[PDB]
Amino acid sequence: ITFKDVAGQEEVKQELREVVEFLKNPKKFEKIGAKIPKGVLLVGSPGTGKTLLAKAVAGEAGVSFFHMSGSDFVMFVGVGASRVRDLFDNARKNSPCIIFIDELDAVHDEREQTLNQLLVEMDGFVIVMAATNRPDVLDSALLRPGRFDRQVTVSLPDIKEREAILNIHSLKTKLSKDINLQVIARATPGASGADLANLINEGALIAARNMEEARDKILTDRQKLETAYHEAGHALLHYYLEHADPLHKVTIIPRGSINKHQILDKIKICYGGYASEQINLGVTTAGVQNDLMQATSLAKKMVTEWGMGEEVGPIFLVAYSENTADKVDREVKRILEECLKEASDILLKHKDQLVKLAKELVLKETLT
Amino acid sequence: ITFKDVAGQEEVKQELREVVEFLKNPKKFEKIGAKIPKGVLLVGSPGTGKTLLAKAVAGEAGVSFFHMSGSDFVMFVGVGASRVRDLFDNARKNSPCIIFIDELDAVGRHDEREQTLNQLLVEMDGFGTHTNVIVMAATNRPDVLDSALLRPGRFDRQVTVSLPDIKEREAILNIHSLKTKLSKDINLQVIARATPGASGADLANLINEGALIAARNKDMEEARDKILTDRQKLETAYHEAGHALLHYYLEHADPLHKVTIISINKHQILDKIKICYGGYASEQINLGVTTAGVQNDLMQATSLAKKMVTEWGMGEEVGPIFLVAYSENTADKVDREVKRILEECLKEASDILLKHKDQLVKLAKELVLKETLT
Amino acid sequence: ITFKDVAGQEEVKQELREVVEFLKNPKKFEKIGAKIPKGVLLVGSPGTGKTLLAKAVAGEAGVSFFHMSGSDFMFVGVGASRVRDLFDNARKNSPCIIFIDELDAVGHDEREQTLNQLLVEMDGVIVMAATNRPDVLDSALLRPGRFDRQVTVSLPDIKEREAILNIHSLKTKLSKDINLQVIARATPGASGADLANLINEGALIAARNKDMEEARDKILTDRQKLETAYHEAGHALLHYYLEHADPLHKVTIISINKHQILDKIKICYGGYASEQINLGVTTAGVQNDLMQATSLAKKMVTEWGMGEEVGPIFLVAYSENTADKVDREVKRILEECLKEASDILLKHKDQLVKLAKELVLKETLT
Amino acid sequence: ITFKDVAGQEEVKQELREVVEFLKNPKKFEKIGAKIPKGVLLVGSPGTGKTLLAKAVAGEAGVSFFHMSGSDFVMFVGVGASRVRDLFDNARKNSPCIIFIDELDAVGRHDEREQTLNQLLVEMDGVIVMAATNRPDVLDSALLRPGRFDRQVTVSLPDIKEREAILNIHSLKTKLSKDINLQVIARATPGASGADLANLINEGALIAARNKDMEEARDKILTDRQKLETAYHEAGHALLHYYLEHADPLHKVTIISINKHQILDKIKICYGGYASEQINLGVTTAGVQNDLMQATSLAKKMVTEWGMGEEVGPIFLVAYSENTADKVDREVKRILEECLKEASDILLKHKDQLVKLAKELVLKETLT
Amino acid sequence: ITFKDVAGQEEVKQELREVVEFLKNPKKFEKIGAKIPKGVLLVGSPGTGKTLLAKAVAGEAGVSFFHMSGSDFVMFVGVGASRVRDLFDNARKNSPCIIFIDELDAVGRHDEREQTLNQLLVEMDGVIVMAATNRPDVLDSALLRPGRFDRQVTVSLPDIKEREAILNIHSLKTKLSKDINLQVIARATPGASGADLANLINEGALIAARNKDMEEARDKITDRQKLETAYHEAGHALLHYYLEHADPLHKVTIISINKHQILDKIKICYGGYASEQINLGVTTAGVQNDLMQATSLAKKMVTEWGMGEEVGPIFLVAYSENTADKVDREVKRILEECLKEASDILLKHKDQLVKLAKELVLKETLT
């Protein structure tokens, strides 16, 4: 297919071009004697259409496309590895070709040698493209030079990308000018490419039986501000804290050698949503969980592992006395309670600046 | 068979029509260029006759029916997957056809099942092609199912089948009665209420048991006992009355869609905990004693409570700390704050129900009457 | 075999007849359009001759008998193949009876699909099954059609025991000097096979040269019958006096309110009490009685929120202080329920001591 | 072989006769219409020559003998089961025959053995099978059911008399001068095995290759006082059975639904040898371990499971509070410390009666 | 090969002769009707050349030698057992033959090995089998039963004398100038293995081909630490004479029990811990196992054997923390009581202990 079939990929699109450009005219890269990346990995949540982009890459390159899922290869004994080799053998025949390995996470057991085979053909010296919803599950070997050395991240669509996406699948149906897609775009924040595509279908199906009715088959404009505050509080602290680095971007679209002074500023920024959550709404949400968990981990690490604890001391505690335990839990509480204060205070001063970002976020959903 | 062979499904019936309507005239849906759902999942307890409805769908659509159980495919090596493909290959041959996958949980999540299910995925993912084959599935335990199964196209539609009410029960007894000799002496309305929250098959088996008791020589009473009060219906009515009544009075709750006898703010979390304790209260407010039926109600309350303290940092004393081994002192803090948060939420609940007790006691009898209401 | 080969089961016998009657004349049941049970499960201890009855059913019905053990049903699918194979040949000899001894064995591994096959085939001939341990069985086994019928086989009483001895006696040369009624009571709660083996052991002891006494000892008290009589007397007597209990269907020497839960705990403490009230000492036979009481107690406190001190909290992990609360409330609830029990039995002690001796005599009553 | 080749078996010999008598004249047993035991199990330590007796049974009966070890059948998949049937098929051909299954423990407890045993069980249910197990409690209860290994015969380590007798048999197989006295070695080797003794001869005969040599061999296998030490442990145990009301006197004393009152007397007996050791030697041995362990178990059961604890109460404890724990540990200590006293006291009075058994045991080694 | 190819085996050599003598003239043993041992096990650390001696046994007996490793037989299913049978079948063909089973631990520990072992046992029950294990306690009891590996011979790391002797043998295989003294290297390498020494030569011979070179090889791996070790072992051994319920050690090298017996052991376990302080004033880490064993016995006295005053006649091996504190303290009592009797004994006879030390630094072993 075309890159015109994909919307709001712009940066990702240009990132994938260097691959497209390779497959077309490898000679320009062969000219200076420059080895081409064999592997490119697409990381993203389900419905981000990681598959769609892979096809489009081949499309824009007019190159052969061989879709293979990790579920397929992952077979009695060596059958999978045979399928791996087999695929690559036929794939080499249609060179320049693209192989897509959906759920690379899928490929212990026969997978081990299947993976080994996957790694084998790759280093053999055709560009392999892979898609993982859960990338931290991946063996480090997969990311080494040559093999999936390139990595491109696909984000849930923003309001602009959402409306744009609705327009593409809309053409596949007869949509009266009465329905506004910008209205639904915002109505569905952090929805997936496929989620939206299915909404249209659901409506189109509802019509023939006889898009708002379809929204309801998903089984608040205020909660968008609530989220706006969690993210506002997080991001705002990066400028004011010395040992932080300003956020590359601030979004309300789900993203589904360090000094004590550096460690602590992080903990403060983790509390920047527990903060603005009261500063603004006076109540805390459950969305702090991971924010609290990360803070607490760093805190525990300071005390137990890094010996940055005043009371507990320069000891590695990672089975000890209950007395020793109470010491840790207490120093952890302090470090955290301090960092929350410094955070609550900073945001209270610049509250006007924070409340600015909130609505701006409820508007643009994303900014830098 | 017919939708006329099924009782107490009217809403479910209308829900299944959109499938029936597809199989008949796919062109109407192909007109605007609208992709048809490939998969439709029926969720319900055993005996709810999830199978019955699936047949009737094909019946009303005059379509081919291929029953396959998850237990079948779930086989040496790839044999199951072969059976999956095999079924779909022959199923494509009788298009428009319906495939029924009873106990989808059996193949729904690794092992042979993994590729067997990976297979179901590929088979049903058919392609842009119409195919005109719709997969129907029935699961007693749906939370066991792999997320992949519920993705767009594949079992994207989900229809929930409820244990029959008093009306559906009597209606059901009448259908299987015709299959036997029913003396005008047996009243089915009497048995209908006598058997609240019984299953379509449970009732159907009662008839059989009677029919069997006959051949050994009213008699349907002796059969009731071979399954081995009207007061307990009020007891249940109180648990559910207490639960539901609180939804109106609590700001951060949403009124219950129905009441039957068959990113969240602290303020939202707490109201839930109160509602959980609801029936625990009405149980004393009305009967002065508590039942064991609170277990899950208590468990869920306590979970939310623990989450507030430990994970969400919504605890006053414990603080904004993530506690998921720590000091016993730290433990006592959690157990104590959890106890408070719960004891509070129970009070707010017990108090509310005490005032509107007359309104709650209204629902009780009304529940013993309608068994279900909005 | 015949139902005449089985003794002291009239009730079980008459329960199995409805199956026998089906196999003979299915048409009468087909007339009114009544589906016949495909599965019937026999639950009982080892030696209760669950197998014997299954044969006899076919016997009295003159029907084909296919014995298959759960232990039999294997590499991969082989067991399932054997399942299918059996049912295929079994369908050929219809009306036939299939007996699945140790259904527990097939009721994870190949068993799963073997079971699935068992279920599969049944859904498609009456299958009979025997389990010593029925709680191990998947609920699926008991669904309508498939083992929907369940019949419980009890260890033989004094009458059934004597009757049983007489049947295997005919298989040997036992002088009229040996009285089987004497041995019947001498062996309370012995199994059909246990008794049958005693005869054999004697018959064997004879050939080496009344002798049946020497055989009793090669198993390598009339007072202990009263001890048991007290445990069961105490248990049963409380059912009448306690409001929220239901009287016991039988007494042998073989959606719940707080108020209902507590009465049970009291009943559990029945035999514990009576042992002291009568013998002044407690036996070890209280274990399960204590365990069940304690479970209910714990459940009241931890899960059901029926604890005064502990509160409406789900504790099923927590501070030691929170633990001590549970252990203490549990102890109270139990110690209370024992008292209410000990007290009741003390008053009606004369009524309890009545049942005791009567039990040493009738062994079972209602 | 003959029963005359086995020594100190007399009781075991008479026990095995009923089997011998069957194999000879099965008609006598067929006369009264008596089904014959298909299985007979021999239980004993290694070297008790469980195998020897099995052969001799066939010998005295002039019957065919088929030795098969559990280790053999225990065989890829079904191979062993086929071997089971194969043996039984050929065994039925030589009927009346005896099959000996050494290390029945090997086939008697996951897969092959499950079917293997099923097969063993299957074939038996269908020739008398004889089996030998050093560890019988490892065996599945199914093995002991009526017909299948329903008979059980226990073989004891040879006493002083059996020892001397045994030495004499293997002596004939060598050139042992009448100067060496076997009664001297018999007592010198208490609780030695039939094979242990037989090996001593061999080792001596091997030493004779250099050309009171049997003494040098005793040492190459790498106390008259310790015999009294043991005599005291066993004296203390046995003596208590007469004096305690709720006990039953020991069937034998060698140096090779229960009431609280019954439970407690046991605990006292368990403490018997622990006491006598102090009363006589003033010191305790380590040989109390199992004696202590069993006492403590009964004690724990009284408190935790049977509700026979005064302080702890009628509660089933088998996770609880530390306070609840301390209660159990303390009640257990009392119950034991009491039962030890009652024991220590009893033995102190009848010390002269206990000291009597001591030497009598160091003499007769066994008594009733 | 020859027994002359092996050095410092003297006692082991004479121990192996009875095997050699059998294989040569079996009739002498068959004369009186005496069954011959089928199995003989060699127990020793790696490099003790357990293999070397096995060959030499056959050599001095002019008998066939069939080397088979446990790693070999240890195969799909029954494959190894077939290899076992095959070996013994062909081995029977070259009778009188010797079979050597290196790493018997590999087949001696169910799995394929179980039936492979069973086959090993089976075949032996039916040629003398010789086996070598570095870890003998891993071995199934069945292996040691009468006939099957009923004989056991222990092979020791070479002493200073055996070391020098060993160096001389592999020296002949190379061009070693009379300038290098092997007695110098012998002591320089205490508790080194037959192969370790042999490899030193090689390493030197390799260093030569690039061209007192044997010294550079030493480094491609302290005379004071010999005294440190001498003290740990001096303290251990010296206590055996003075303690009533002990038995003196057969030798001292630098390479149903009464309470009274148990306790003396604990004191002995503390010997080296003491002597290190009495002499060097500091304790080493080499006490670990010495402490561990002491503590185990201590714990056993209290918990299992009911030899504890405070804890009582109770079997404790899940209990209250209060009950725990009682145990941990009875132990520190017994343990410190023991270390004391010991520390004192060694303080008095310190002059006797300091003697054994130097004698040890010299003799490396003594009786």
Ligand SMILES: Nc1ncnc2c1ncn2[C@@H]1O[C@H](COP(=O)(O)OP(=O)(O)O)[C@@H](O)[C@H]1O
């Ligand atoms: N640019 C896009 N706009 C809209 N929908 C898209 C886009 N890209 C992909 N999709 C949708 O995503 C779904 C497929 O996602 P896929 O490519 O398989 O990624 P994933 O690996 O996350 O499932 C399809 O339903 C497709 O319509």
Ligand SMILES: Nc1ncnc2c1ncn2[C@@H]1O[C@H](COP(=O)(O)OP(=O)(O)O)[C@@H](O)[C@H]1O
């Ligand atoms: N509408 C109905 N009324 C009465 N009984 C019904 C109805 N639908 C199904 N049943 C009964 O349900 C049983 C089968 O349930 P099934 O369709 O298999 O659902 P499940 O998957 O829960 O077992 C049969 O005994 C049938 O008689």
Ligand SMILES: Nc1ncnc2c1ncn2[C@@H]1O[C@H](COP(=O)(O)OP(=O)(O)O)[C@@H](O)[C@H]1O
């Ligand atoms: N009615 C009976 N009277 C006496 N013995 C009986 C009777 N029924 C069965 N038995 C005995 O029970 C044994 C078989 O029990 P079985 O039928 O296999 O049941 P289980 O499954 O409990 O083993 C045989 O020894 C047989 O003699």
Ligand SMILES: Nc1ncnc2c1ncn2[C@@H]1O[C@H](COP(=O)(O)OP(=O)(O)O)[C@@H](O)[C@H]1O
């Ligand atoms: N009566 C006996 N007297 C002496 N030795 C005996 C006797 N019976 C057997 N043995 C010895 O026992 C050993 C074999 O024991 P075995 O019969 O296999 O029993 P186990 O199963 O305990 O090993 C042989 O060495 C044999 O000499």
Ligand SMILES: Nc1ncnc2c1ncn2[C@@H]1O[C@H](COP(=O)(O)OP(=O)(O)O)[C@@H](O)[C@H]1O
């Ligand atoms: N007497 C000896 N003197 C010196 N080296 C020896 C001697 N015996 C064996 N070795 C050495 O031991 C090594 C082999 O040890 P080996 O016989 O396999 O015993 P292990 O089983 O401990 O490895 C060889 O390098 C050999 O040179």
Ligand SMILES: [Zn+2]
């Ligand atoms: Zn509820």
Ligand SMILES: [Zn+2]
């Ligand atoms: Zn009871």
Ligand SMILES: [Zn+2]
């Ligand atoms: Zn003992």
Ligand SMILES: [Zn+2]
């Ligand atoms: Zn040491």
